[model samples]
Target chain A: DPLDHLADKLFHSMGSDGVYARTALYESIVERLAALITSHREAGTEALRFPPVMSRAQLEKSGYLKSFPNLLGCVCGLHGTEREINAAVSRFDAGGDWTTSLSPADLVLSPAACYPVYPIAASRGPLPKGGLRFDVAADCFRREPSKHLDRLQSFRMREYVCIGTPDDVSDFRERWMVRAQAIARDLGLTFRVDYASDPFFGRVGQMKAVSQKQQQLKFELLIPLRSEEQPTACMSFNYHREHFGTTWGIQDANGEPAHTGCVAFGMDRLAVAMFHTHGTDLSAWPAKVRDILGLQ
Target chain B: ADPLDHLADKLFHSMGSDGVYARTALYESIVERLAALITSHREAGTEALRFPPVMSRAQLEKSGYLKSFPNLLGCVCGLHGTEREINAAVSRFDAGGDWTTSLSPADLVLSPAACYPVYPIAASRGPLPKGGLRFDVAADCFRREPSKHLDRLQSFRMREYVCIGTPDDVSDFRERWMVRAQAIARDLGLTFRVDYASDPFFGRVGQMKAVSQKQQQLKFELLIPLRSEEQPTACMSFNYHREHFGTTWGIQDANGEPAHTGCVAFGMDRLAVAMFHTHGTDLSAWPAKVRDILGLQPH
Candidate 1:
């Protein structure tokens, strides 16, 4: 079966099953893709680069734990009196379960690029008349400890989010859908946009997924990185439609629940597709793609 | 008493009390300049590796961070169960129960330092060159210490240039950086002191190691005032690990001797905060010499 050999060729692992570090050559290209995304920053947009972790309280309020309990990763650490912690350390030295000494910390690994933006916005009171725009990025995590090479357990995510009225959210999604396709073309990626649904969990989430699909609230940009027949989603456009506003107490200019939407880029997956499609050589890529990504 | 609001509105927005931050553009720009300042001084062959905030738990375990600062380490964990159990966990979370109890450790852990991977990586390359290998590594570091004082930041950026080789090779490299850092500190218009330091290792066995480190002058810190004028923060650190990495990773130097390592570390956020503390948050109003050194063009 065809797979992304770049992970093997361009990343190194140390006995860790799923996590790998980027080699210099691979990171150079990833940084190029990152720069290209940052290049799209427009007026009225704020740029934010987030750490990989987020506040656990906010995650709880976001209802993410309930929706995707299987996917979330939390930070845990050892605690207790000096003597107690020493006992745990000795146990580890004696080939015991040292990890058992740890308990859940106050932070969780961020599941998506856009989760923290709402809390930031919600704290500032009402939205502006024209709404808010953000160019955000994060190192995201998931619990898929095993899968194909492209199905990474840890990866980078990029999102352009808008929050305000329903019109603001819808217009933002519609514009990005067209803009994203154009950007894909410029990058010389062979792709298509299709109506998509998120991996909402549980039977209750199944109903929610059906509702999301019925309303056509999500669209994904697909690329055939591993196989031509079975493609991967490298980008997604979603109209969250007041789900975040209601969760975070975000108010619109007219004093109602503000609507929200975002266009997310699976950064590593996009870079993986570029390597797979372009044969891991910057010089081999089409002129327009190289120029747009500024790989020269 | 949440020290989260350190810089308030001018530069930082703290998401929580435990070192997570949403830095504003001003903060980002300053950090950018600091990174550039450090890298501009690098030699021709120094490789730069940007590591993730999380590392392979196996590597960390092998590095013995668990033995040293077990309390400060953060392990990644997620829910593992049958599909039916996952749904039950979801229901439990929705019903205000502690669903987190279902999470088990993942393959990775939050990185405690930036340079742990370099040892194994360098070891994988077999023997080092005659002059040894130099690497500039950076990562978002995590410390799981719960704090209420507006002192040191827990989660922060750690940037270090690590030299790997024989004892003389690594020690000389560290000594050179210390001298260079002093001159750089002068240009930044800051007052600091260098002193021997020790690691906060666990219990009695670890306490002995800490004393030995200080006694042998294995660790030196460039301290600057952040919260305490009396007790400053160790914004920069230099340490000589006498074959600790080599012994652990089975690395051999050019002469087939167990390799030694020394690193010059810069705390990105803490250093920037020190600059703000020394001058002011207004980058434009900073001292002319400092501005020129950091290339902060007047706005």
Candidate 2:
């Protein structure tokens, strides 16, 4: 209840269902948190800021369309001759559904921060001996339609990805798993690391989800954002054995299929966790946490 | 000769869709320099806000964007049926059949302007202070344009300084920003001209509205030539919406009158492309004075 009260003061719900217009106080912490994520980027990591929408063909090629059909956000546009477009515009005055002219645009909203990276890396050629690492961020969208602080319809995702041999990817994910634990401790968070699976849709996807859990391919850093009983996954560590590498024909140094992994930071959720745990006042936050975030 | 051709494979890669592109690092770096220039000039009391690229459909309806520029708006959509039904659509997709045609309306739409969400937000904060409110807001705005021109991006970055207050307050804000923007243009070593303009409204009815808007001198564009010297692109726009948004959102000022609104918007992508086209693709060879202003490091 107190967190909601604080949220009221810190956010202006811009008439959107799951989005809010963040005030400076809240945005300040979000920016600092993002910078903290960026701080962990190693040397030689290629940094990219991706647009919110990506090509529809790219999403289809990534196999996201077949897997997560329910959650995908499609961009729709009006298509017709000039006279027909004029009719649709005028008919709207008489309560006509102008959307009848709508058709899917060539783009879809990006579902993940790393979705754009695979094709880009593949286009450049085979991975180097050191492999390809990217510090990527994007505005990701999903159509869950929830007002929960943790489950945003549109949110910022910051990810550091590694595409290399399975050994290298596993090592990279493991290093972050340990580093993230220490970072969470410094933030004074009550958290846990646990195995997780994506919310794949339907019976077909159910089998895939079970197989994913059995393989232990995913890990999540869960923190209590709204209530202590049911915490949210603020960060995710994933290993895609050869899904993307093969999909994009990304070859490792030895010319074999590359293995990929990434540690994803839910920027909005982490900011919420920080505010929920440390209270609203920036200066009153734990001194160590403030230092980690470079809060003045 | 097409200007984009001169910079092809050097700046951006077309993302299949017309007006959508992913710029190379070199191009994006120039965009950052332009953004920093805009950020550096914010007034003493101006608050800064950044919105996501999408806004709620309700917010879009409230802005009356559909009434004015329906052709340019993009609506967000998604599957709304049961899991079984969605599975069929997925199957259709995998089978190379149409899938997107089945998508229903989602809760949001792509944002058309950077300063839209700022209005109702100000209204909710009760009456404004005597001096009114000024904000530095930016967003990746979307327009449904099918064009081959490199500068007319469908999805582009927009940075705006919006002012909400009395008529005098808005007029002063608009005039002051026009002056400051011209000076910034000069600082970047680009030649431009300010011209009275009108929004590309829709249909015959909207044409009358556009003519009225132009007659009132409500909109002005700062044009910089990229491909053609005779017909340059409008890289920056200044608009005076006299009590349109404030009245729509019911934002009253300290004097208890409906507030007027004005915004100075920079089409950052176009501006950056203009710079790259003007100055050769070899960034290091750009003018030393221009490089210093942009804080470009010599390669």
Best by TM-score: 1
Q: Which pairs clash in the backbone of model 2?
A: none
Tens digits of per-residue lDDT for model 2, A1-296: 33466657566676776677677677778878877877788888877777788888988998887778888998987767767777776677677777777788888988998887888888889888979898887889987876676777888998999999998898899899998888788879899998888988888889988888888799999997767677889999998889999998999999999999999999888888888888888878878888888875
State in Å the error of residue A172, model 1: 1.0
lDDT of 2 by residue, B154-211 (tens): 8899999999998888899999999999999998888899999999997787889999
Q: Best-fitting candidate, measured by lDDT?
A: 2
Q: In candidate 1, which residue pairs clash?
A: none
iRMS of candidate 1, Å: 1.7
Assess each model's interface with DockQ, reporting 2 decimals per model.
0.63, 0.53
TM-score for candidate 2, residues paired by index: 0.93
